[PDB]
Each structure stands twice: as structure tokens, then as C-alpha cells.
Amino acid sequence: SYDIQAWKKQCEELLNLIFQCEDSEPFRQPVDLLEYPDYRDIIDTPMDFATVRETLEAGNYESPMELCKDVRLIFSNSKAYTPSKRSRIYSMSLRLSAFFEEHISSVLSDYKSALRFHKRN
Ligand SMILES: COc1ccc(C)cc1NC(=O)N1CCN(C(=O)c2ccco2)CC1
């Protein structure tokens, strides 16, 4: 299964499934500084799923590893900002992260396999 480009549509479909999850709603759009005015004191690099989708559609990811790094930043930002590991929004982040990791595993493996096949000779 050695298509070097297949990861892009596979990531588009996974982002579609994440946008259907009720657990994504806090992470769809960049955090609101008016409601969370200390947010940028704690978080150096904001990230959200609309930015990830736009970066993918613009043709500004070279690999699914780069996309996976930006999605993992959404989750590390939620863990760094939570005032409590028992909070609603952080709790939603941990369920969404498990879902994402379960689905992205084979996208990464297939891409890396396809690049090794390309370099086989
Ligand atoms: C309902 O969400 C929205 C609706 C509409 C907009 C425009 C933004 C948000 N996100 C938003 O306000 N967030 C709060 C701060 N975050 C955290 O990860 C976190 C951990 C513990 C408390 O917050 C990111 C998500």
C-alpha cells in the first residue's frame, strides 16, 4: 500500500470525524482571549482544529508527522492551561486525544512504509 500522497485525504477524513465529535467543540476555533485574558501568559503557541484543517488545505504540511505535531499541541495546550486535571474542557481533550491517536497510528505507519518503499533501491 505504497501511495506516498494517501495521508492527505486520510487526515481530511479524520478531521471530519473530529468535527462531528461533541468533544471537539472547545478546540475548533482559536481560544477567546476576552473570556481567558491570562491564556497567552501560559500558552506560547495557540493551536486549534480549524487552523490544522486550513494548513492542510493550503498545502502547508509536508507529512502527516507535521499535522500530528500541531494536533498534539492542541492537547498539550489544554493540559498546560487547565486549572484542574478534573476540569470539563481538559476531560474532553483527553477523550478526543485517545480517539485521534487510535486513528492516526495507521496513517503514520502507511506513510513511513511508502517512503521506505520509494527509497528501497
Ligand atoms: C468552548 O470553547 C470555545 C468556544 C469558542 C471559541 C472561539 C473558543 C473556545 N475555546 C475555549 O474557550 N477554550 C478554553 C481554554 N482551553 C482549554 O483547553 C482549557 C482547559 C481548561 C480550561 O480551558 C481551550 C478551549
Short mmCIF file of N, CA and C and ligand atoms in Angstrom, two decimals:
data_model
loop_
_atom_site.label_atom_id
_atom_site.label_comp_id
_atom_site.label_asym_id
_atom_site.label_seq_id
_atom_site.Cartn_x
_atom_site.Cartn_y
_atom_site.Cartn_z
N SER A 1 0.87 -1.23 0.00
CA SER A 1 0.00 0.00 0.00
C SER A 1 0.88 1.25 0.00
N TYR A 2 1.57 1.55 -1.12
CA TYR A 2 2.79 2.40 -1.09
C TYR A 2 2.51 3.79 -1.70
N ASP A 3 1.29 4.30 -1.57
CA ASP A 3 0.95 5.67 -2.04
C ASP A 3 1.48 6.71 -1.05
N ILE A 4 2.51 7.44 -1.47
CA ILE A 4 3.22 8.49 -0.67
C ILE A 4 2.28 9.66 -0.36
N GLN A 5 1.23 9.87 -1.16
CA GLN A 5 0.34 11.05 -1.01
C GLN A 5 -0.98 10.70 -0.28
N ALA A 6 -1.25 9.42 0.03
CA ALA A 6 -2.58 8.98 0.56
C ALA A 6 -2.90 9.60 1.95
N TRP A 7 -1.87 9.96 2.72
CA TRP A 7 -2.07 10.51 4.07
C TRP A 7 -2.95 11.75 4.04
N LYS A 8 -2.95 12.54 2.94
CA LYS A 8 -3.62 13.85 2.99
C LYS A 8 -5.14 13.68 3.10
N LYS A 9 -5.71 12.86 2.22
CA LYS A 9 -7.17 12.60 2.28
C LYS A 9 -7.52 11.82 3.56
N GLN A 10 -6.64 10.93 4.01
CA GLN A 10 -6.89 10.20 5.27
C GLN A 10 -6.96 11.20 6.45
N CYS A 11 -6.12 12.24 6.45
CA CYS A 11 -6.16 13.26 7.50
C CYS A 11 -7.39 14.15 7.32
N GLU A 12 -7.79 14.49 6.10
CA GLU A 12 -9.03 15.26 5.89
C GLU A 12 -10.23 14.52 6.49
N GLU A 13 -10.34 13.22 6.22
CA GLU A 13 -11.47 12.41 6.74
C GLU A 13 -11.39 12.35 8.27
N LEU A 14 -10.20 12.17 8.85
CA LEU A 14 -10.09 12.11 10.33
C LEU A 14 -10.50 13.46 10.92
N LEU A 15 -10.12 14.59 10.31
CA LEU A 15 -10.56 15.91 10.81
C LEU A 15 -12.07 16.03 10.70
N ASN A 16 -12.68 15.53 9.64
CA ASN A 16 -14.16 15.49 9.55
C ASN A 16 -14.75 14.73 10.75
N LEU A 17 -14.25 13.58 11.09
CA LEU A 17 -14.76 12.79 12.24
C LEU A 17 -14.54 13.58 13.52
N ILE A 18 -13.42 14.29 13.68
CA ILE A 18 -13.15 15.08 14.91
C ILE A 18 -14.17 16.22 15.00
N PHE A 19 -14.45 16.92 13.91
CA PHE A 19 -15.50 17.97 13.89
C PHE A 19 -16.91 17.40 14.18
N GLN A 20 -17.21 16.12 13.96
CA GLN A 20 -18.54 15.50 14.35
C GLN A 20 -18.61 15.13 15.85
N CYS A 21 -17.46 14.96 16.49
CA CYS A 21 -17.33 14.66 17.94
C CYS A 21 -17.77 15.88 18.74
N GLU A 22 -18.72 15.72 19.67
CA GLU A 22 -19.06 16.84 20.59
C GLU A 22 -17.83 17.27 21.44
N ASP A 23 -16.94 16.32 21.69
CA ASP A 23 -15.72 16.61 22.47
C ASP A 23 -14.76 17.60 21.78
N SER A 24 -14.92 17.87 20.49
CA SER A 24 -14.03 18.84 19.81
C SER A 24 -14.47 20.30 19.96
N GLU A 25 -15.70 20.58 20.38
CA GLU A 25 -16.25 21.95 20.17
C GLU A 25 -15.32 23.01 20.78
N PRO A 26 -14.69 22.81 21.97
CA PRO A 26 -13.81 23.85 22.53
C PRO A 26 -12.51 24.11 21.77
N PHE A 27 -12.16 23.17 20.89
CA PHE A 27 -10.87 23.12 20.17
C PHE A 27 -11.05 23.45 18.69
N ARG A 28 -12.24 23.81 18.23
CA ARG A 28 -12.50 24.01 16.78
C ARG A 28 -11.88 25.33 16.33
N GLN A 29 -11.86 26.34 17.19
CA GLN A 29 -11.52 27.72 16.82
C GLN A 29 -10.51 28.24 17.84
N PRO A 30 -9.67 29.23 17.49
CA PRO A 30 -8.61 29.67 18.38
C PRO A 30 -9.26 30.18 19.67
N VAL A 31 -8.60 29.94 20.80
CA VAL A 31 -9.09 30.34 22.15
C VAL A 31 -9.41 31.84 22.12
N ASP A 32 -10.46 32.18 22.89
CA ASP A 32 -11.05 33.53 23.12
C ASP A 32 -10.29 34.21 24.27
N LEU A 33 -9.49 35.23 23.96
CA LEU A 33 -8.66 35.95 24.97
C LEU A 33 -9.55 36.83 25.85
N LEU A 34 -10.70 37.29 25.34
CA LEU A 34 -11.62 38.16 26.13
C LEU A 34 -12.09 37.37 27.36
N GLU A 35 -12.51 36.11 27.16
CA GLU A 35 -13.02 35.20 28.23
C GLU A 35 -11.86 34.66 29.07
N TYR A 36 -10.70 34.40 28.44
CA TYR A 36 -9.50 33.83 29.09
C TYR A 36 -8.34 34.82 28.93
N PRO A 37 -8.36 35.99 29.62
CA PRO A 37 -7.36 37.03 29.36
C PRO A 37 -5.94 36.66 29.83
N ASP A 38 -5.78 35.65 30.69
CA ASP A 38 -4.43 35.15 31.06
C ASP A 38 -3.93 34.08 30.07
N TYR A 39 -4.69 33.70 29.04
CA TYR A 39 -4.37 32.49 28.23
C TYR A 39 -2.94 32.60 27.66
N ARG A 40 -2.61 33.74 27.04
CA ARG A 40 -1.32 33.94 26.32
C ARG A 40 -0.15 34.18 27.29
N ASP A 41 -0.42 34.33 28.60
CA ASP A 41 0.65 34.34 29.64
C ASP A 41 1.22 32.92 29.79
N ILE A 42 0.37 31.90 29.63
CA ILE A 42 0.69 30.46 29.88
C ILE A 42 1.09 29.76 28.57
N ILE A 43 0.38 30.05 27.49
CA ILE A 43 0.46 29.30 26.20
C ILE A 43 1.25 30.13 25.19
N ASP A 44 2.41 29.63 24.78
CA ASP A 44 3.30 30.35 23.82
C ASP A 44 2.82 30.17 22.38
N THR A 45 2.22 29.02 22.03
CA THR A 45 1.83 28.75 20.63
C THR A 45 0.38 28.24 20.59
N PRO A 46 -0.64 29.10 20.44
CA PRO A 46 -2.02 28.62 20.31
C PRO A 46 -2.17 27.71 19.08
N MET A 47 -3.08 26.74 19.21
CA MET A 47 -3.39 25.85 18.07
C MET A 47 -4.84 25.37 18.22
N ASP A 48 -5.51 25.13 17.09
CA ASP A 48 -6.91 24.66 17.09
C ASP A 48 -7.15 23.86 15.81
N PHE A 49 -8.28 23.14 15.72
CA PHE A 49 -8.51 22.23 14.58
C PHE A 49 -8.83 22.99 13.30
N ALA A 50 -9.43 24.18 13.36
CA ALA A 50 -9.63 24.97 12.13
C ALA A 50 -8.29 25.42 11.53
N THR A 51 -7.35 25.79 12.36
CA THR A 51 -6.01 26.13 11.85
C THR A 51 -5.37 24.89 11.22
N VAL A 52 -5.47 23.74 11.88
CA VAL A 52 -4.89 22.49 11.29
C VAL A 52 -5.53 22.21 9.92
N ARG A 53 -6.85 22.25 9.82
CA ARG A 53 -7.53 21.99 8.53
C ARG A 53 -7.09 23.01 7.47
N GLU A 54 -7.01 24.28 7.83
CA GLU A 54 -6.61 25.30 6.83
C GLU A 54 -5.17 25.07 6.40
N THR A 55 -4.26 24.72 7.28
CA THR A 55 -2.84 24.47 6.95
C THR A 55 -2.78 23.28 5.98
N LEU A 56 -3.54 22.21 6.25
CA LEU A 56 -3.60 21.04 5.34
C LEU A 56 -4.12 21.44 3.98
N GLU A 57 -5.26 22.13 3.92
CA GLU A 57 -5.89 22.53 2.62
C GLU A 57 -4.98 23.49 1.84
N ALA A 58 -4.25 24.36 2.51
CA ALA A 58 -3.31 25.30 1.83
C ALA A 58 -2.15 24.55 1.19
N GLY A 59 -1.94 23.25 1.51
CA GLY A 59 -0.74 22.55 1.06
C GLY A 59 0.50 22.96 1.82
N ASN A 60 0.38 23.20 3.14
CA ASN A 60 1.48 23.71 4.01
C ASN A 60 1.90 22.69 5.11
N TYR A 61 1.45 21.43 4.99
CA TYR A 61 2.08 20.27 5.68
C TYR A 61 2.85 19.44 4.64
N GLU A 62 4.09 19.04 4.94
CA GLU A 62 4.86 18.13 4.04
C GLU A 62 4.61 16.65 4.38
N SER A 63 4.06 16.33 5.54
CA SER A 63 3.93 14.94 6.03
C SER A 63 2.85 14.88 7.08
N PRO A 64 2.31 13.68 7.35
CA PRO A 64 1.34 13.55 8.43
C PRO A 64 2.01 13.72 9.80
N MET A 65 3.33 13.53 9.91
CA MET A 65 4.03 13.79 11.20
C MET A 65 3.88 15.27 11.57
N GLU A 66 4.00 16.18 10.61
CA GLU A 66 3.87 17.61 10.91
C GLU A 66 2.44 17.90 11.42
N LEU A 67 1.41 17.36 10.75
CA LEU A 67 0.00 17.54 11.17
C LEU A 67 -0.17 17.00 12.60
N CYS A 68 0.40 15.84 12.87
CA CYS A 68 0.27 15.14 14.18
C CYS A 68 0.90 16.02 15.26
N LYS A 69 2.00 16.73 14.95
CA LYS A 69 2.65 17.63 15.93
C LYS A 69 1.70 18.80 16.27
N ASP A 70 1.05 19.40 15.29
CA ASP A 70 0.11 20.51 15.56
C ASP A 70 -1.10 19.99 16.35
N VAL A 71 -1.63 18.81 16.03
CA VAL A 71 -2.81 18.29 16.78
C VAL A 71 -2.39 18.00 18.23
N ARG A 72 -1.21 17.42 18.43
CA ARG A 72 -0.71 17.13 19.79
C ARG A 72 -0.52 18.44 20.58
N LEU A 73 -0.21 19.54 19.91
CA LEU A 73 -0.07 20.86 20.57
C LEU A 73 -1.43 21.33 21.10
N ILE A 74 -2.52 21.08 20.35
CA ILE A 74 -3.87 21.43 20.87
C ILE A 74 -4.04 20.78 22.25
N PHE A 75 -3.66 19.52 22.37
CA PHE A 75 -3.90 18.76 23.62
C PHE A 75 -2.91 19.19 24.70
N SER A 76 -1.63 19.41 24.38
CA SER A 76 -0.70 19.86 25.43
C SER A 76 -1.09 21.26 25.89
N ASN A 77 -1.57 22.13 25.03
CA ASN A 77 -2.02 23.47 25.47
C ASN A 77 -3.16 23.31 26.47
N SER A 78 -4.14 22.44 26.20
CA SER A 78 -5.27 22.26 27.14
C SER A 78 -4.74 21.76 28.48
N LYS A 79 -3.82 20.82 28.49
CA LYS A 79 -3.24 20.32 29.77
C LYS A 79 -2.44 21.40 30.50
N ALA A 80 -1.76 22.25 29.80
CA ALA A 80 -0.99 23.33 30.45
C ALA A 80 -1.92 24.39 30.99
N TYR A 81 -3.02 24.71 30.33
CA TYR A 81 -3.90 25.80 30.75
C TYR A 81 -4.91 25.37 31.82
N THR A 82 -5.24 24.09 31.89
CA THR A 82 -6.31 23.64 32.82
C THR A 82 -5.91 24.08 34.22
N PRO A 83 -6.84 24.67 35.01
CA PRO A 83 -6.55 24.98 36.41
C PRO A 83 -6.66 23.70 37.26
N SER A 84 -7.19 22.63 36.65
CA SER A 84 -7.56 21.35 37.30
C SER A 84 -7.51 20.21 36.28
N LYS A 85 -6.95 19.06 36.64
CA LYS A 85 -6.96 17.87 35.75
C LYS A 85 -8.33 17.17 35.84
N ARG A 86 -9.27 17.72 36.64
CA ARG A 86 -10.68 17.26 36.81
C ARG A 86 -11.65 18.18 36.07
N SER A 87 -11.16 19.04 35.18
CA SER A 87 -11.99 20.07 34.52
C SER A 87 -12.73 19.50 33.31
N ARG A 88 -13.86 20.12 32.96
CA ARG A 88 -14.67 19.77 31.77
C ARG A 88 -13.82 19.83 30.50
N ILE A 89 -13.24 20.97 30.20
CA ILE A 89 -12.56 21.11 28.88
C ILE A 89 -11.36 20.19 28.80
N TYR A 90 -10.54 20.07 29.84
CA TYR A 90 -9.39 19.15 29.81
C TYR A 90 -9.87 17.72 29.67
N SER A 91 -10.94 17.35 30.37
CA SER A 91 -11.52 15.99 30.30
C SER A 91 -11.93 15.66 28.85
N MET A 92 -12.56 16.61 28.15
CA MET A 92 -12.95 16.47 26.72
C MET A 92 -11.66 16.29 25.90
N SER A 93 -10.60 17.01 26.25
CA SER A 93 -9.32 16.94 25.49
C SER A 93 -8.77 15.51 25.57
N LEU A 94 -8.84 14.87 26.73
CA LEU A 94 -8.23 13.53 26.90
C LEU A 94 -9.02 12.49 26.11
N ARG A 95 -10.35 12.60 26.05
CA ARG A 95 -11.14 11.66 25.21
C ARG A 95 -10.81 11.90 23.73
N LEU A 96 -10.76 13.16 23.30
CA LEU A 96 -10.50 13.44 21.88
C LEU A 96 -9.09 12.98 21.49
N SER A 97 -8.11 13.16 22.38
CA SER A 97 -6.72 12.74 22.14
C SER A 97 -6.71 11.22 21.93
N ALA A 98 -7.39 10.43 22.78
CA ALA A 98 -7.37 8.96 22.62
C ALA A 98 -7.96 8.58 21.28
N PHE A 99 -9.04 9.25 20.88
CA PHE A 99 -9.68 8.98 19.56
C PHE A 99 -8.70 9.28 18.43
N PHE A 100 -8.08 10.48 18.51
CA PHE A 100 -7.11 10.89 17.48
C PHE A 100 -5.95 9.90 17.37
N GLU A 101 -5.36 9.52 18.49
CA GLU A 101 -4.19 8.63 18.47
C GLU A 101 -4.59 7.27 17.90
N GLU A 102 -5.79 6.77 18.22
CA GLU A 102 -6.25 5.46 17.70
C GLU A 102 -6.31 5.48 16.19
N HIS A 103 -6.75 6.59 15.58
CA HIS A 103 -6.96 6.71 14.12
C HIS A 103 -5.66 7.11 13.38
N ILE A 104 -4.83 7.98 13.94
CA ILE A 104 -3.64 8.49 13.20
C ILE A 104 -2.53 7.43 13.13
N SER A 105 -2.53 6.43 14.02
CA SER A 105 -1.47 5.39 14.08
C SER A 105 -1.21 4.79 12.69
N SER A 106 -2.25 4.33 11.99
CA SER A 106 -2.07 3.64 10.69
C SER A 106 -1.74 4.65 9.59
N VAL A 107 -2.19 5.90 9.70
CA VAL A 107 -1.83 6.94 8.69
C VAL A 107 -0.31 7.13 8.73
N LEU A 108 0.26 7.25 9.92
CA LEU A 108 1.72 7.43 10.06
C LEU A 108 2.45 6.19 9.56
N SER A 109 2.05 5.02 10.01
CA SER A 109 2.74 3.77 9.60
C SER A 109 2.72 3.63 8.06
N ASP A 110 1.56 3.83 7.43
CA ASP A 110 1.44 3.66 5.96
C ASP A 110 2.35 4.67 5.24
N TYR A 111 2.36 5.92 5.68
CA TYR A 111 3.21 6.95 5.04
C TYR A 111 4.67 6.53 5.17
N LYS A 112 5.09 6.16 6.38
CA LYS A 112 6.51 5.86 6.58
C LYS A 112 6.90 4.62 5.75
N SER A 113 6.02 3.64 5.68
CA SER A 113 6.20 2.43 4.84
C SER A 113 6.39 2.84 3.37
N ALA A 114 5.51 3.72 2.88
CA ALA A 114 5.52 4.20 1.48
C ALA A 114 6.79 4.92 1.19
N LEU A 115 7.36 5.73 2.09
CA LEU A 115 8.61 6.42 1.83
C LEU A 115 9.72 5.41 1.81
N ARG A 116 9.71 4.40 2.73
CA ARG A 116 10.79 3.40 2.69
C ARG A 116 10.71 2.63 1.35
N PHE A 117 9.52 2.28 0.87
CA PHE A 117 9.43 1.58 -0.43
C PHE A 117 10.01 2.44 -1.56
N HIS A 118 9.76 3.73 -1.50
CA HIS A 118 10.26 4.68 -2.55
C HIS A 118 11.79 4.67 -2.60
N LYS A 119 12.44 4.51 -1.45
CA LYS A 119 13.92 4.53 -1.31
C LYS A 119 14.52 3.11 -1.35
N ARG A 120 13.71 2.08 -1.64
CA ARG A 120 14.13 0.66 -1.47
C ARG A 120 15.38 0.26 -2.28
N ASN A 121 15.63 0.90 -3.42
CA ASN A 121 16.71 0.50 -4.37
C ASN A 121 17.85 1.52 -4.31
C1 LIG B 1 -15.92 26.45 24.39
O1 LIG B 1 -14.70 26.66 23.71
C2 LIG B 1 -14.64 27.66 22.79
C3 LIG B 1 -15.71 28.21 22.09
C4 LIG B 1 -15.48 29.23 21.19
C5 LIG B 1 -14.19 29.75 20.97
C6 LIG B 1 -13.96 30.86 19.99
C7 LIG B 1 -13.14 29.20 21.67
C8 LIG B 1 -13.34 28.16 22.58
N1 LIG B 1 -12.29 27.59 23.33
C9 LIG B 1 -12.09 27.84 24.66
O2 LIG B 1 -12.70 28.76 25.22
N2 LIG B 1 -11.21 27.05 25.33
C10 LIG B 1 -10.91 27.37 26.73
C11 LIG B 1 -9.44 27.23 27.05
N3 LIG B 1 -8.99 25.91 26.61
C12 LIG B 1 -8.61 24.86 27.36
O3 LIG B 1 -8.07 23.92 26.81
C13 LIG B 1 -8.95 24.72 28.76
C14 LIG B 1 -8.55 23.80 29.68
C15 LIG B 1 -9.22 24.11 30.89
C16 LIG B 1 -9.99 25.21 30.63
O4 LIG B 1 -9.84 25.59 29.33
C17 LIG B 1 -9.11 25.78 25.16
C18 LIG B 1 -10.57 25.84 24.81
#
